[PDB]
């Protein structure tokens, strides 16, 4: 009975600080926590022509990189479940909890 938390954010600093908070809250509730295991980063690269008309050779490359973190709550305790749902993370981070 492991509660799995998946975190995805565009910035790692937010994801790491969020990871620390979620792990702590569960550990404070006394649930065993393993992680936060870092999932391989996903990067999407967009190549666009820099100019408005012609000039194909000049290109600009942009990237959007999603940082992923996996957290597993080994032992489910009533306090932990409520606390994990209760935790308010920064706006950037996206959290998915599988119980």
């Amino acid at each position: 009975q492991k509660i799995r938390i998946r975190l995805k954010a565009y910035d790692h600093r937010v994801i790491d600080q969020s990871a620390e908070k979620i792990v702590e809250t569960a550990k404070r509730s006394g649930a065993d926590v393993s992680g936060p295991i870092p999932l391989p980063t996903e990067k999407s690269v967009y190549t666009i022509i820099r100019a408005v008309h012609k000039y194909k050779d000049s290109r600009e490359q942009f990237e959007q990189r999603t940082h992923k973190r996996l957290i597993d709550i080994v032992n489910p305790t009533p306090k932990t479940v409520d606390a994990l749902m209760g935790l308010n993370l920064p706006s950037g981070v996206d959290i998915e909890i599988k119980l």
Binding site: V45, Y46, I48, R50, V52, Q61, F62, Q64
Partner: protein, 60 residues
């Protein structure tokens, strides 16, 4: 794009194949990205302003 063309793209076509994408900011027919729904010029402008989440200049 002309106002009528932008209007016609928005209107439901007789067939699905007839439907086409335009840049939502400016209505440019070509080079419209699906994820952002923006043309190449508009995408660049907004990325520079930091108004597209997560998008930054790429170097490697």
């Amino acid at each position: 794009a002309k106002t009528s063309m932008v209007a016609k793209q928005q209107k439901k076509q007789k067939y699905a194949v007839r439907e086409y994408t335009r840049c939502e900011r400016c209505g440019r027919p070509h080079s419209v990205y699906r994820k952002f729904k923006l043309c190449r010029i508009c995408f660049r402008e907004l990325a520079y302003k930091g108004q597209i989440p997560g998008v930054r200049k790429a170097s490697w």
